[PDB]
Amino acid sequence: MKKWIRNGTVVTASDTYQADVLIDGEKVVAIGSDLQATDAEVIDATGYYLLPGGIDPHTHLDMPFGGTVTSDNFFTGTKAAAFGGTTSIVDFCLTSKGESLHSAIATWHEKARGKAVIDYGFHLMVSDANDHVLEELESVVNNEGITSLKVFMAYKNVLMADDETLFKTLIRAKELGALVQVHAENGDVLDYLTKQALAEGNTDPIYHAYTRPPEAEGEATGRAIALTALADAQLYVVHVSCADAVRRIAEAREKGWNVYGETCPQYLVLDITALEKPDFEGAKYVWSPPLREKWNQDVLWSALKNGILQTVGSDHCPFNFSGQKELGRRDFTKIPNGGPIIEDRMTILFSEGVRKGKISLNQFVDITSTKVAKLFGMFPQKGTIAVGSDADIVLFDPTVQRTISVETHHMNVDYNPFEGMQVHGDVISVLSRGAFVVRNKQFVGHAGAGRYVKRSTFARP
Amino acid sequence: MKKWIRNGTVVTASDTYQADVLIDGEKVVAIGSDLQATDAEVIDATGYYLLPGGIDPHTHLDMPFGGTVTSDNFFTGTKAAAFGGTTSIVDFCLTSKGESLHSAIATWHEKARGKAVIDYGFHLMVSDANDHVLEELESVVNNEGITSLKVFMAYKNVLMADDETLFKTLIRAKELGALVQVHAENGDVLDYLTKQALAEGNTDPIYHAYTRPPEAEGEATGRAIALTALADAQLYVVHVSCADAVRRIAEAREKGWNVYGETCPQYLVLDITALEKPDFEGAKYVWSPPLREKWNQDVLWSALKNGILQTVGSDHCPFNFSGQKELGRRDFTKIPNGGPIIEDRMTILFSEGVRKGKISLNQFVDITSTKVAKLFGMFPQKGTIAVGSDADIVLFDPTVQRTISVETHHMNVDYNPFEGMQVHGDVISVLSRGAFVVRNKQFVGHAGAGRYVKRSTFARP
Amino acid sequence: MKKWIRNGTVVTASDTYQADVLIDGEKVVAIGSDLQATDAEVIDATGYYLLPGGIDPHTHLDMPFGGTVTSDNFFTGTKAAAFGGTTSIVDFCLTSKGESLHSAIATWHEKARGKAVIDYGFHLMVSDANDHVLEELESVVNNEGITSLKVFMAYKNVLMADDETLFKTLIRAKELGALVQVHAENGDVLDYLTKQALAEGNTDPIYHAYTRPPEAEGEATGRAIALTALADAQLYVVHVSCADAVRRIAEAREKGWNVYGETCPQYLVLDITALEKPDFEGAKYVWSPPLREKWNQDVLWSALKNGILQTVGSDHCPFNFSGQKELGRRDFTKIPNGGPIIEDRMTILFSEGVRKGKISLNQFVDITSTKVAKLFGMFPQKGTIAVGSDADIVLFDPTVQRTISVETHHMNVDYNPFEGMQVHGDVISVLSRGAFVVRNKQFVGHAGAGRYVKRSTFARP
Amino acid sequence: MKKWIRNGTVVTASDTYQADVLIDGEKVVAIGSDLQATDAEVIDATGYYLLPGGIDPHTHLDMPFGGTVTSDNFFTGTKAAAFGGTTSIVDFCLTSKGESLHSAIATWHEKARGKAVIDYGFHLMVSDANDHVLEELESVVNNEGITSLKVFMAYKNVLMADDETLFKTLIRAKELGALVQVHAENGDVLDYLTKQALAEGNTDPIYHAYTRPPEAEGEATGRAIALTALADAQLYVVHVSCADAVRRIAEAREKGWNVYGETCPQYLVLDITALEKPDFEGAKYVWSPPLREKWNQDVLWSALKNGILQTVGSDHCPFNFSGQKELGRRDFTKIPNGGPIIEDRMTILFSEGVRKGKISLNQFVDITSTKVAKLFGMFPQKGTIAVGSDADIVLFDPTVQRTISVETHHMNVDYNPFEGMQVHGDVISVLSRGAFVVRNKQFVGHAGAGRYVKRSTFARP
Ligand SMILES: [Zn+2]
Ligand SMILES: [Zn+2]
Ligand SMILES: [Zn+2]
Ligand SMILES: [Zn+2]
Ligand SMILES: [Zn+2]
Ligand SMILES: [Zn+2]
């Protein structure tokens, strides 16, 4: 069918203008001030912005981790993303040594198939870069459409890879046109500190932060950057949380190296003091890299404003406070690491970022949608509002005041780390490929509506 | 009338897509794959890109300088810009101490009125920030629509202002919402070096470079940046030519200061060796800051690619080689400083930048058009292709090979500093507010078609 | 006299050992563990260090400044220096435009003649680098023995010079073998901020600090550095007070530029909160650059420890609280700027530096004596304990705990800014050229004992 | 014996003066211009400097490495050191996983026993920081007198340790008062590049350099620095060869971190073009990190001049060209790595450093002797000329012009990498603890004269 969205203000990464948008089937087919569309359903967007749907490049739905499994699966997690104004996600497909990459990819398709309500791609974890793995990456990149590869530099004995793996992966990625993502903390420094903490009887949630100091994130960021330059490759640093890491990324980019950075709402608006909340409440805020001294936030906002960081992802990795986070009572090393971030990413960036003059409204689109599509090979199918693009559009009311709460969220988790936060901005309706997923804050989509996105090889934005 | 541009590929700072564009009168009114426009003139754009018209924020048409007057006036200079794919310019209105700002503004309107073939704004030179000047700036910014103020830190005893002027101007600009531009070289260091050179009998064109070392540009860049931070203001450094200056701008932006930078085609593709050309030919390349050791070029390209510099202007400031540049035979200090750059800016950036993978095609639009409109208060009227924007559009054929030459250029000057340069890309047709200025490489516009643009107060991009 | 100093521990910039020191006349002639000297007066130094006498390169004795004259003259100031373990000073000879350099220097000789109790050199202020001055500097360096030239970048309309003067002074100084010293704050920024504070009714002492932000010191430090590199000269930055400036000096020195830095005890141990003391008590702490946020102190200590700053001077510039500082009641711009620092320089560096592990004992001697002599052309005559040195020697008891007080100090001023500070270390006896000046904490010297030192041209240490 | 060294000029890290030196037994007992010593042997030092004997903190005598053993043992190597003006060495005791530290140390004592001609200390290699090793380090430091621990970050499968070992060593070293030394190149990057070169048929000596780019040294220098700050420890970076590494050390030191750097004569005066010499001659210059582009040399010289690097060691690790270096004909990875550098360290630093104005004469002594003693816990026994020091003294004639040649050197190796280099400066006589080792350029010492030095725990210089 045709849909004619009228009387709204389109805002993209470049443009801001009043016009109507005509959708035919899955795609935008016209934009204009006087289209006189026949036989289209009229959607009234008076008082709204039309935004390109957010694309969250950093999700962990139905992920085995921390001795348990994340509490949103592909159905609940994508539904919560859609309520939060996000229309595509790119989730991390994890691998184990000795298992083929393709088997892990099949496992991830089976997590999503028939369950996702909006569109999804996958990244692929590389645990080690043995010759068989390196050979396998060719069809992964070219045929499976997975063109970003994740290397974890922390989580020793669980996800951690070493310098040989990371350097080989960067060399191979350059050959194949893949982007290499890193989780950049020094896992060996962290392993020693956490063990020392526990030996001293320091077991409360706050020691999750103290045992991962920012210098450890800075060091691993710099190491990944050096190996990227030595490979002439392209690097994407996920969840940059601190000024130490920002400085290193800024220096690398001034040298003209192809180094990109992401940050996340939790590092913008939350700080290390949240982990001190008594009665185990601090465990709600345990995720890695840890929350930082509050002064780091403004350095992150500056880096987004001045183009040193290019994207915002959620690192959505939810565990209930009851039962799951409680695995870590008495031992912070056993608290499953991760927060429930997918749903509030867009609104927090608008309300704390745009409305406070930290970034522009056009930058907000670039960082939440367009630059993410471009770095992850989904542009221009996704990430904009333009003729020929999938009709993945959010009707957003910037005037609504509301309080973020577990009482009104849609993530399948028993708390919200932004509980009580006042924001402006409300996601009213959400289209995915021209079909409504959310309409007037009610879910009208369905399990399995979402489709897998085969992503293109890397091109610089 | 209506014009329906069909079968082309639209490229803007964000988007790239195949669709038709419908113009009605001065403005774009629809974009779409199947518009079925009635009663419109069909323009066939098969095999072309549709680009937003270039906006050159750095021109000096009919400028008194160097003991003479620049050789393009508002008619020839705007016609040459249009042939070169540039549809708007922002020219420097010069002032003298003791003269009202408003009198200089009237003088500049009289240079342009009835003569410009495409649209124009003005910046305003501040020579000194006495209380009367500071009072006058209020109606300049709010009523005359001149929202960028230029301070020259070099050209002692001609254009040069001091730290008191620059700091006061930055404070006042922050109050009024103006952007402060600087020409950043240390004029006192330069004055001493040029005098020493001449005392030693060093009079050839090459000593124009030797007497303005990059450290002098670095120093003044850093000084303007510090005073901007101390004022909490916003700074635009014009013609950044060297790595010393790039490093300082990159450090300032990592601190989250509102510091922006421009570079120019001459600093990207030409180097200090051009000034050594014998038989006085070196005088063709005398402009300030001088051409640099060639290694600086890649640092400039890196800075554009990674968002540390945001715009490219020409610093079009032409003087004939015969007669005018010859004022400096025997004394390089009397060679009128400036090059003929307006016409080749867009094609050089495409051919040396996009085609060689130094910047993306979307970045090329951002740096030549969209980011310039945004920093100079002309967006979204100018700088994009979108519903409601002025129909200022270039039909650009990226496949054409040609040689840049004085034999085929349109600038009213007897040489081209890019003589013999091979490029790809040809500007085929150029619309300004929906009327053709150039059509199939022939001039079909007219003197006085162009209109003055009253620019908005500063907003961060 | 022969004097034989027995049973003490010699400490120099390199060496720490137990041995006896034989003085014959004005000079050390032997050092050894069993000298069996005859016809020598035995001085028992049991439990003492023998230190080379402090050399204070930064004094302002009998200076016309701030609408009055500093309250120590050459007699009372050199007596207070000696009681503080300092045996040589280098004082700033001021000039004014149009005045012959030689007449200024004659004035300063008359201030010191028959009055100085210990030895003294002069720096020479340069207010203006006109051709006549540049010619006269040949004799200043080669007849008068003045090989350091001071340029003030602040104090507009009083002491301030511009970049023309600074750059020409640096070029001339390189020719002559002179060191250029700078007071590096941006005078034009400060002039505007101070006038704005007053106009806003912000007249209290604290606004002395707020109108001279650290970025104004960093900017001018950077500008003097760039001009020094442009001249291939040598620079000495007096009173570095803040991390902004240290960072710039560290960067210059990594490039191999000949840039040296000084700091002062007030910037190591006092902070901006002192200026907030009510009832005009904050006027006691008014000197420039101003006291800084306390975090800056450890950056300065780091820079001394790691060789980025090489010296400690006092900037002794004393004004009584009663009468003199009160010139600025109701208007902080009229508080004469300067602290009474000469007497406590050595003890503060030992007690807050050495004893706290911030610098070593040998570094203590280097920064207070040896490296001062080397940078200001007084070595090896002054600045060490070695055969052939002048016998300028302090017997220092490091075990004595005491308070600093106006009650026990010898500066001719009615307060001490370190009032109530607990320290270790006591200056017991002081020799200047083999003669006692202080013996067992009583004055035994004489007005006029001190000699003018003609200093050598610059050599890197 | 009493020896009375007359009419020479003493030079230390602080002092330069004319005086006589009296030695009684092993120690300096007096210094003075008229000592009238009796029953002393008169040594005429007219026209000589008296220097404190060089202390070479970086030797590999009788080392099993590279499929063979270095060609100087403790006798021939210490004899060559003495002829080069070096009177103490600190050699690297190697360990292997599972081996007791005390057994390794016993092995090294047996290498030196009855063989060393001058005094020697040992560093200890740490291959693995398992709990047993960390416990054994208590006695290594507090019984064996070994207070510097070496961690190799390259030489995979041979000497390399990982970040777990490095970080735990740094924490343990801080507890114990030990200095941690690092060979900082990224071993995993190097392993991959070396294998890739071979697979591509790039087997010549030059590929030794191309497979260890400077960024791999910068990365590992940065990583050791970050781990040191994380442990609040003290680090000494051996053989800094390139600007990338210097920049990182300069940055660490400006933060106040206790990070020290060493460089070596080969990196000051040889460059990467040496490895291109044909007919396998480039194998002569194969050592790691590799020779660098020549521009790096002046950055190193700058860093010594301005105190960013504090020492010069040799990395003496000699292999004959015939037989030993030839192990790597057809495969540069099998050329045993190391140069014959011990003998020429002092003269090269004097002739290319002091005489050319790159460092001062007093800095020369500091970096070759005094600051080495201080960092490695041998001061004041060693490293200076002062009452109570060991009488380790070099008579040095600075006026002698000569060539360096295998024909006249004393290292037990068939080539000298400085063959044909013109220098000034000749080592005439050398005293170790008051006894001649070299006298008028002939060997007069004896195998076993040298003593093991138990070194003190770390104190900042
Ligand atoms: Zn992660
Ligand atoms: Zn994650
Ligand atoms: Zn200019
Ligand atoms: Zn210009
Ligand atoms: Zn001053
Ligand atoms: Zn002063």
Ligand SMILES: [Zn+2]
């Ligand atoms: Zn090594």
Ligand SMILES: [Zn+2]
């Ligand atoms: Zn070695």
